[PDB]
Ligand binder design. Sequence first.
Ligand SMILES: *[C@@H]1O[C@H](CO)[C@@H](O[C@@H]2O[C@H](CO)[C@@H](O)[C@H](O)[C@H]2NC(C)=O)[C@H](O)[C@H]1NC(C)=O
Ligand SMILES: *[C@@H]1O[C@H](CO)[C@@H](O)[C@H](O)[C@H]1NC(C)=O
Ligand SMILES: *[C@@H]1O[C@H](CO)[C@@H](O)[C@H](O)[C@H]1NC(C)=O
Ligand SMILES: *[C@@H]1O[C@H](CO)[C@@H](O)[C@H](O)[C@H]1NC(C)=O
Lengths: 172, 172, 172, 50, 106
Amino acid sequence: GLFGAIAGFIENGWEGMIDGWYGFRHQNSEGTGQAADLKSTQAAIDQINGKLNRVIEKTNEKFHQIEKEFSEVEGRIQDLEKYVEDTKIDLWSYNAELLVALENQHTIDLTDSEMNKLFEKTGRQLRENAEDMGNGCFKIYHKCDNACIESIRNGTYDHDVYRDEALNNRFQ
Amino acid sequence: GLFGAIAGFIENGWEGMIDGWYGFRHQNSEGTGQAADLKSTQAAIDQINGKLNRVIEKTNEKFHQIEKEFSEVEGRIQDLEKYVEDTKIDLWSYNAELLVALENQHTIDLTDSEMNKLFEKTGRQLRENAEDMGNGCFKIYHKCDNACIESIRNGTYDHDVYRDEALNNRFQ
Amino acid sequence: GLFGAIAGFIENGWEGMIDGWYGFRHQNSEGTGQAADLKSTQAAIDQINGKLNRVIEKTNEKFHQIEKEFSEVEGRIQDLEKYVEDTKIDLWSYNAELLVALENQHTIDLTDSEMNKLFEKTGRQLRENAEDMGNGCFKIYHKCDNACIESIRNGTYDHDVYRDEALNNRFQ
Amino acid sequence: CISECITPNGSIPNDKPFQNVNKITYGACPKYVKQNTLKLATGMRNVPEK
Amino acid sequence: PGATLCLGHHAVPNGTLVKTITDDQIEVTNATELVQSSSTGKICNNPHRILDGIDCTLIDALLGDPHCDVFQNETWDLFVERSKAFSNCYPYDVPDYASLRSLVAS
Ligand SMILES: *[C@@H]1O[C@H](CO)[C@@H](O[C@@H]2O[C@H](CO)[C@@H](O)[C@H](O)[C@H]2NC(C)=O)[C@H](O)[C@H]1NC(C)=O
Ligand SMILES: *[C@@H]1O[C@H](CO)[C@@H](O)[C@H](O)[C@H]1NC(C)=O
Ligand SMILES: *[C@@H]1O[C@H](CO)[C@@H](O)[C@H](O)[C@H]1NC(C)=O
Ligand SMILES: *[C@@H]1O[C@H](CO)[C@@H](O)[C@H](O)[C@H]1NC(C)=O
């Protein structure tokens, strides 16, 4: 995808994440764990439901039209009727093919994007207290118990509390 | 948007920024201020005017066509004329709906993109003399007067001049 | 482009890079050199060949159709035949214009994207051992001979080996 | 010679998706359009200079 | 004591102009043409079975105008009518000529 996260620096997805689309796995002094990120999951879901509803909205209603099957050869007028119908069907088939191609390219790209946005947001919370390991994981340079991990996940992590400890571990 | 800046890490737009589409607000020892960034504003404006000009270019010129309203019931030939017109209108109406949907998705995405590019460029100028606070603002770790701020804004900031001071403030 | 690498923070392309689409130039204690990046080059090439093959696939096969030129004035039925054909042609002409516009915008953005992904991946390998100079170049803060440069290019660079040296040079 | 697509002007190749030779065609033919050229980019932006 | 590592991409002295959503003309390194705009000027006799009508219209052949009787029992994928065709038999008209021509051709 364009952002290089999914099928990118994130090497693969987690079959074991069964309660969300995007999320976190951690290891700290209290063990390991996993949690879905509700906001990013919901952002992707909301966009996909949006485009789905735009596509499946409003079939057209048509009533009396032209005949499309014929039991006798008629020549000029039937050729024209059949040509009009074939032309119409071919144009719509083209529209359908193009529509799904564009939508799907964009769906892959927007989900890739959401993954990337979550990674960038997390990095930004962490400031100088963590480093990007390049595989979608952060090495956090201070003791970070379960409540600390959750503070990162819920967006209230206070980097200043840990900054002295982290810098000492990173640089000395 | 795909980039996560507008309605993203930038929490909201500035009704008070009235002279550009993108820009800077600062606080330093001489007070606070705001300045439009002309290059990013003009890049977005240029792209939007480009696509507008592609869309509103060249209406078709048509002259003698077929009749589209009828005062007598006629059957087969009228059925076909009306079907041809109905089919045409339905296809163009589809083209119009799809055209504005794709353009608008892309307009939102390109403006989001420009916001993100300006932010990244600024970050790159600052090198190790600043840190990203995660809300689209940089904390600059050295005295930076009005001329310094302007040096960042006009793209001539020399990080080496301030590097010693900044690192002392960041890390010690 | 959306990513701001090509015709962006990368100031220009290299006419002298003749064995690839993307790559590296370096200067170190053993001189200077250049090498194509095969993976990024092939990723862009593979995507472009993919969209090309989707576009040039399967012309439609049509046989007996309607007449499209006429040697006598006939009025109503001919009017309708000519209108059906003109209508068809205008719709296909629109499809062709739009198709190349969308594809080309997307081609520019995907190549810009591949450039940006290579830059980000390299940055991530280097960890704290290099800094982004803002023009698409990394300043590497340790002695890095030809084999070292090659370890970066082939994705096996071990940042820990160089970390003490690099941090000493960056921060002290 | 061999060609899938026939127009009143003569045969044409059908490797391209569109054609501007004649609206009259027979066989597996590119679709007729008004434009005489349409270029599909097959490479990145060319930026030899700043 | 260190090194520099720069990322970049190729370019060529002159590329090709293409159209995008936002630009009528923008230069890329390469492009390919999607509109076939030329012909050799000749109809290829394969793979389709071509029947050259020469001096005869399909209708004159149908009726059996003597100079068209060469076409008796003939078949075609594509019948090609030439501008030089002429009738040489009893003068006739066909109400709805266009339709008879169409249904036989098909
Ligand atoms: C193929 O033949 C067609 C039909 O004869 C050509 O179209 C004509 O072109 C001339 C010169 O441009 C015009 O004056 C006529 O008005 C056109 N006729 C019609 C009905 O459109 C066409 O130019 C030929 N194409 C090629 C590539 O040889
Ligand atoms: C975030 O996590 C912390 C740590 O357990 C908790 O104290 C706090 O209530 C949480 N905040 C929110 C907004 O849920
Ligand atoms: C940028 O700002 C500095 C500081 O005020 C000023 O000296 C310089 O003239 C400006 N440069 C440009 C290119 O405008
Ligand atoms: C990467 O480069 C190093 C140094 O030149 C070399 O030893 C190694 O064989 C290379 N690895 C791969 C995967 O080619």
